[PDB]
C-alpha cells in the first residue's frame, strides 16, 4: 500500500539556477526518508537522511524538508552545477519494507560563453568502414534530433570540459557506413544554428 511518487521525471536547466525535486508517499508511517544520487553505470550515493522526527536536513547546497503527516519531502538544490547531473532517488523505510521512487533525471547545462557552431568531417579510419561527422561548439539551447535514416547513428549532445583552458563545449556525433551519406546532410533533421560553419569539405 506504500506508493512513492517523484516529479518531475526529468529536468533540464541552465547552470546556476536553483532546483526543486519533489517526493511524495501515501503511507505516513515511515522511520526515515533518504535522498540519493546515481550516476550512469554506477551505484547510489546517500545525500541526506531525514529521521521521522525531523523536519529538515541540510548539507552544502542541498536542503530537504520532510512533512511526514502530509506525505511529502522536497529537495532544494541551490545554484546548480554541471556535476549535479545525475538521477535523484527518494526512498522511504517503512516498518518492514523499503520503497524507492522512480527518480528525477537531472541535466544541468553549461552556459557556453562563445558559441562557434560547426559540422566537421573526421578523417577516414583505415581500420573502420564508417564515416564520422562532428557537430560541435553550439549553445546549450540547441536540440540534437535523430536521423530520418535508420542506418545513420546520431548521439545526443555531450559536454566536455577543457579545464586548463577555461573552456567547455557541446558536441554530437553522427556516423554511417552507407555511401549516400555526407556531413553536409548528417544533421538535416535537427534545428541547427543558421550560422553553423560547414567547411569545404568537412561537409559537401
Amino acid at each position: 500500500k506504500q506508493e512513492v511518487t517523484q516529479i518531475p521525471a526529468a529536468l533540464s536547466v541552465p547552470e546556476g539556477e536553483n532546483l526543486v525535486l519533489n517526493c511524495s508517499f501515501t503511507d505516513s508511517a515511515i522511520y526515515n526518508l533518504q535522498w540519493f544520487r546515481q550516476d550512469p553505470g554506477k551505484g547510489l550515493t546517500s545525500l541526506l537522511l531525514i529521521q521521522s522526527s525531523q523536519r529538515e536536513q541540510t548539507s552544502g547546497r542541498l536542503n530537504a524538508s520532510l512533512d511526514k503527516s502530509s506525505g511529502r519531502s522536497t529537495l532544494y538544490i541551490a545554484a546548480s552545477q554541471p556535476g549535479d547531473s545525475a538521477t535523484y532517488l527518494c526512498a522511504v523505510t517503512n516498518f518492514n519494507k523499503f520503497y524507492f521512487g522512480s527518480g528525477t533525471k537531472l541535466n544541468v547545462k553549461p552556459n557556453i560563453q562563445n558559441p562557434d557552431p560547426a559540422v566537421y568531417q573526421l578523417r577516414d579510419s583505415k581500420s573502420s568502414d564508417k564515416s564520422v561527422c562532428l557537430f560541435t561548439d553550439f549553445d546549450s539551447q540547441t536540440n540534437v534530433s535523430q536521423s530520418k535514416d535508420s542506418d545513420v547513428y546520431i548521439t545526443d549532445k555531450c559536454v566536455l570540459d577543457m579545464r586548463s583552458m577555461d573552456f567547455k563545449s557541446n558536441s554530437a556525433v553522427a556516423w554511417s557506413n552507407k555511401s549516400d551519406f555526407a556531413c553536409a546532410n548528417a544533421f538535416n533533421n535537427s534545428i541547427i544554428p543558421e550560422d553553423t560553419f560547414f567547411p569545404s569539405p568537412e561537409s559537401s
Partner: protein, 244 residues
Amino acid sequence: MKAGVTQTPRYLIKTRGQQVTLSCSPISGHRSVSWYQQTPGQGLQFLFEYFSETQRNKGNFPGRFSGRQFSNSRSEMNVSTLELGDSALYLCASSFDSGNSPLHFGNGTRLTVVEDLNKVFPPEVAVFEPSEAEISHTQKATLVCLATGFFPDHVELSWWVNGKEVHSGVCTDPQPLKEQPALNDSRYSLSSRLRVSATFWQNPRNHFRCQVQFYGLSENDEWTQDRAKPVTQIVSAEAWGRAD
C-alpha cells in the same frame, strides 16, 4: 585507504534456466546488508535485508530469489531458473542500522540473461583523427572513438594519452544506442570524444589510445560457432599526433 562496499562478480552472462550466486562485502563496521534489483522498467526493487546472519526484512520476489549472510557480515544472493527479465543491476547496500543510518551502495553485479550465447559479440573499436578545418578554425582537435556491434552492454571505455588515463577534455555517451532499436538482442554502439589543443595534436610523439573492456563469456561456457569465442577482453584503437 578504506574499502567501500564490494560486490563480485561485476558482470555475468547466463542463459535461460541457469542459476547465479552473487556476493557482497559491507563496509567494515556495517552489519546490515540489503539487496535490490534495478531494471529500466521497474526501477529499484527491494529483495531482502540481513543482520547478524538472519533475514530481517523481505520484498515481494518469488522464492527462486534467495539470500544468506555469514558471520563476518558478508552476504550472498542466489537466483534460480533464470529468465530474460531477470537481466538487471543487482545492487548491495550496507548500513550500520537501516532504520536510522544511511545506506551505502556498491556498484552492483550486472547480469544479462540471453536465449543463446550466439547473441554475444565483442565491440569493434576505432579512433577517428581530427578534422583539419577544426584545427584551423578553433586551434583545438577532437578525436572520436566508436565502440560498435557489442552485446550485451558490458563495456567500459577509457582514454589514455602517453599511457596516463585522461578525463579532461573527454565526453562519453551516458548510454549506448541500440543499432536495431526494436529488438531484445540488438547490438549496441557507443561514442566518445577527446579534445586537445591543436599544438598538442601536432606533436608526433603524443600517443592516444581508446580502450574498451568487454565482459563476456567464461572459460566454462561452451562455444561451437565459427567466429572467435566472445570472452572477456580489451579491444583498443590508437593514434599518434602529426604536423596537422
